[PDB]
Ligand binder design. Sequence first.
Ligand SMILES: Cc1nccn2c(NC(=O)CN3c4ccccc4Oc4ccccc43)c(-c3ccccc3)nc12
Length: 303
Amino acid sequence: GLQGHIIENPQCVHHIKRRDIVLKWELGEGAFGKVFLAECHNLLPEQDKMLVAVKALKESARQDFQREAELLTMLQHQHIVRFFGVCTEGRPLLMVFEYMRHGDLNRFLRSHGPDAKLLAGGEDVAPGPLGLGQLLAVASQVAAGMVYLAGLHFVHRDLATRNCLVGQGLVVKIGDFGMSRDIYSTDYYRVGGRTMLPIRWMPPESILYRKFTTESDVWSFGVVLWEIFTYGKQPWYQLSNTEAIDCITQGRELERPRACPPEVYAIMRGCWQREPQQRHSIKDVHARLQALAQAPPVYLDVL
Ligand SMILES: Cc1nccn2c(NC(=O)CN3c4ccccc4Oc4ccccc43)c(-c3ccccc3)nc12
């Protein structure tokens, strides 16, 4: 079905009473519904009242909602956005997620870019552009989520920074509320009717043959690594959608970002081997990123 829609995977759901959810205000909006900030009571022992993100269904839908809830409940990992469960008592149908204070990683990258000064600094992040060690910590975390999805044989098909969230202490997790085509329409190619393909993130076998695997996700992860080291720039931004299809199917690679050490660009190139079976595993890409994120400053300073 839709690239990046969890029910594209063919592999218990917690219920929350409507009275325990108090909507505060809207956070975002798309064709399939809205996301609110809400207070959720009686959800976690430590917290009598905590903030959550609530996704309200705009309403087939109820059967898609049921299979989404099943698959979200099955995902339990430090770098997948936490799903608390559903409110099916009347309407609208609600899904309850942890609140990720910094929003999506593309927005977070662009607001800590090469132009950032003292004012960009805050609780969680230093002033000025994100440093090598912070960029590596972001990439490591997204890779760890992708290790977990690969271990469960899930394929994402729309992995991009816009589809990752950033929380307190710069925790980064894979997740979205199904509105990236509404909020970031320029990141998709419209192919008639309603279909919208994230071509700039897709390998040749996906664009040419419509094949999607663990190995096409690793390609997409390579593109995520490029977005991180460009502070959120669009891949192929100088190109039209058809120009980008021509570049990707002809074997052109994204150029080393200014902020990317050769060792890291080598990790991006391992994700971009033309032949899927020749790309490095997500386990290996994650081991190499984690090692660099955790490396002492004396080592990172000469990278
Ligand atoms: C309509 C639609 N079009 C595209 C993507 N859409 C999503 N997005 C995802 O399914 C992304 N997704 C995910 C996908 C694939 C593997 C693992 C995944 O882990 C997650 C973990 C937490 C949140 C989300 C995911 C939704 C949607 C539905 C209910 C709840 C939330 C989001 N609806 C859509």
